[model samples]
Target: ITGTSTVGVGRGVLGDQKNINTTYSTYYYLQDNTRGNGIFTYDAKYRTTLPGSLWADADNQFFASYDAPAVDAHYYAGVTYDYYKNVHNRLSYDGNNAAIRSSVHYSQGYNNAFWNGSQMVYGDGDGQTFIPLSGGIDVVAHELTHAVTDYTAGLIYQNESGAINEAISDIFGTLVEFYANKNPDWEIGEDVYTPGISGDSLRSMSDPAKYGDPDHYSKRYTGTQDNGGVHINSGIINKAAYLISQGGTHYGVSVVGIGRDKLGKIFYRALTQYLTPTSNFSQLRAAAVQSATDLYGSTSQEVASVKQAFDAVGVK
Candidate 1:
């Protein structure tokens, strides 16, 4: 708030060169007002704590080795904000231009990221599995979408509702990735996943079974692990969403391809207008079908495709 406009050059966790926004205050700080009031990125400095401090720079350049995560976290947050505003016509995560905040380098060797019910948090994965989660645009969009869901559907983070919550994140996260057109695919976290391997992802919407995740409702994990398998059972809904967008046959059932934009429209409508905190898979199917009908008419192929997609996933 007390600085002149400036731009910083930095290498991201993925070794990509990107320009970052900084305010030339006492030094340059990682703050950008390009998106509404502002989008701020903080550095946690290997601590298991809340946001530590705004990343300050000695110059308007950030190519230092340790600044990679901070650079990407700042840039990706801006992209996600742009996506929600531009594509969905939503002001921000709350449709009200709420400030987006993120913290990177959160704890030593941490390997996960989350919303924590408020701002987004990213980890600098133990240097083996993941580099830094913010390096992945899909991962950034995925975590931020949770905040959007919290503001909209408020899907409970347990049981079927929780899986719905997780799947919604993956769905829009993938959509946002496609929106950016950066080697778009139906896989999640491929960019920052397994630095030592290629063509691998944390999960796959095109084929959830690729990572041993269930693509069929009948195969959903029923155990109490992972918050009632919020991450595991989400494969079922993720597969359904994938089928809805790209079209595919599973378990002897088939869905017509509706394309990604229409798919996003239908799901966004369902999340904002029809889904509830405790909506189960059955409820989701109803919401999706109703949303499609409302958008493309009750007799349209879009509505039928939604139905077929859910059917293919055994949601009914």
Candidate 2:
């Protein structure tokens, strides 16, 4: 029989007189809900409150908005779970049948979203510039992908490591959207920001050039002053991979052709099986080509196309 825990937040006694600790934090826990001993503590934070849900629900089970929090969350969770399970054979975020949990309405008009150690959290936007962070599937997947990275490379949140960490999540988040067929545009957070705004997404893989901001990575892009430009510069590799998938004309030069699944696969293979914490664009290029060669065969057209995409982007 399946079971659910009803423990409340705070430093208080858990069921069976055990100690349960929390700071009003929200998250998910495995069925065991314990460590070496028969005790259950928080594991991963998904969403701390309702508005924090930001459309975590995709089926509108929560019916919190035109896009429900429960529906979005469940949709993202299912997409993420299916991707790992089908693509990587992972069961859940932790590769186990862990029970995922989320909360919403975390704070008053908060503009950011995050995945704490035990759950994900978002602040409802002041409703002027941004909406609930959960309102977007890409955002949901982005935060959850962090949990997966933590379980793997644990990329440090700085410099190259930070960029890669951001890249992995962005890559998978886009893939999830693609697989779900949510929107082929590959822009992040389009649902949250008001349409009146010129720039809405937090990141863009299709055309980072549309942002018209010098901060984002283009062929001639230079790193700016924002957190090593992990979010900004990510557009470089992101657009490269997207172009490879969509078979588009190169940013600065010619055209190339490769399947979307093939491109995403090579990148993912390199990410999970090859690239390391300190990996950069050049290293990523090498790993992706090797992965393509290994998965698609050295002489395969797909392999050559993958390499061509990398070279076309100046990564080689």
Candidate 3:
């Protein structure tokens, strides 16, 4: 089940296992397993231990858990498609008619979910601390947006590029969560884990420093992590973007605009349409400001809002 299509393999786990059924609809373009193989088999485990394990393979049937891979895959595919078509006015993954493929039950206890260049892959969590990584819209949206990042800016995945990647995903991911009318608070991956754990959420958009990590850029955080701590240092940019776009009260300043969706469009356009591969924070600031000014007049409320948000968030 990829898009809005369903292929059934009988109605029970052991009854009529050879029969095949499918449902196709044009409006939603989604897939569902409830119509066909309505077997909830927790008796045998769904093995996720192999590298690039195929979920339907007969060998890995013993490790199966309650995590629904088919449902998870369809949920994200629909969400990502809706986000691009309704919000961004783009079609499919490549924006030029490319089919999006997603795989679930990727590996046993894989813990992390990511986009590996072409398709989306999800992992069953450790179950003690984390749930299935594909359980929530925001988490799936975050992974799909990685494909968007690859297509648009080709952000280098380190330092500034890495921050850009993370920021874009967080922004769109939060928007998807909001669009879907899920919980607010602009938190990431809250539903992935079970309930009580320290490593529950990875990053924060509204309150970066609330986690007591370095909320700003400094020489000390410049080196050890991925791409100059691109993932970790992403908090600073995430904070700045949130402050600028949402106009919240933080760091003793008020964001100019109360909604982030409009402002985020400006940044996305600048990053994809204006900036280049090696763009740094300074370059990003200039590009965003320029984009705001270009989209709206220098003295217009939108432009004013963009500038104020950028400054309030600590972007020089």
Candidate 4:
């Protein structure tokens, strides 16, 4: 719908007050023009329909309990856009100012989110494992990063390539969380996961083994489930990324910490410049090493640490 750009104030799913970009025409719509072409939010209304309807409100204010997910979805999309533009100098998910769209309140008791090859979608959660998933900035960023991967490396969605795809999303998602500086940690979905529990997350990049994920490559799952264990085996790459940024010892191998910014730079370069659709774990290590060398130097600790981080995680 055509409308004048405006701002709306509301409480997010986490019970924090925030402002979101909306449009004012026949009714206030959750659409922001400040980033890319625009970032729009829609309502799935507890149905299985995809991109149900453009959310409409009577006024440019949203504070109702049902508005919580929309508010966060809109706000987080903006933040994720800003993270890419400001940090990577990339515009939107396609690096060409593609308009961002998201849908909230999707299906009753749904507990997952995904990019779906076009737009973002979030579930309200089953109330036991999660709340509204958009409540977590990391979750929002993770799903959007899938779009990024689709546009960039186009990593295949099976076996080692798929694990790399998942890990790439988790890597940038965690980086975006730290960039926002909102209770930043090396954990994924810690903010909105398991509201009844404290200090628990859907996945821990710092220690993927904590949740039965492989911190070492040898432990990677090889069965024909979950697209060849994309989510499960991604732990190996996630562990490598964590070690690259924060330095650690695992299985008697040690890595030197290079900090988050450098880690992001290296990975971004690899994803955009070096990786291919079918790149495997060994190819990923080579790409990271080459990326660090290009950004730093052959003799730089950055390059050395990239190798050590992968080796420490048994990603040779």
- TM-score of predicted structure 3: 0.78
Candidate number with greatest TM-score: 4
Q: Score candidate 4 by lDDT.
A: 0.93
Clashing pairs in 4: none
Q: Arrange candidates, best TM-score first.
A: 4, 1, 3, 2
- Cα lDDT tens digits, model 1, 23-56, are 8878888899778777888889899688888888
Q: Report, for all candidates in order, the number of backbone clashes.
A: 0, 36, 12, 0
lDDT of each: 0.90, 0.58, 0.62, 0.93
Candidate 2 on 141-173: residue-level lDDT in tens?
A: 778788877766566666556766776777787
Candidate order by lDDT, decreasing, is 4, 1, 3, 2
lDDT for 88 in candidate 3 is 73
Better model by TM-score, 1 or 2?
Answer: 1
Candidate 2 scores a C-alpha RMSD against the true structure in Å of: 9.0
lDDT of 4 at 308: 97
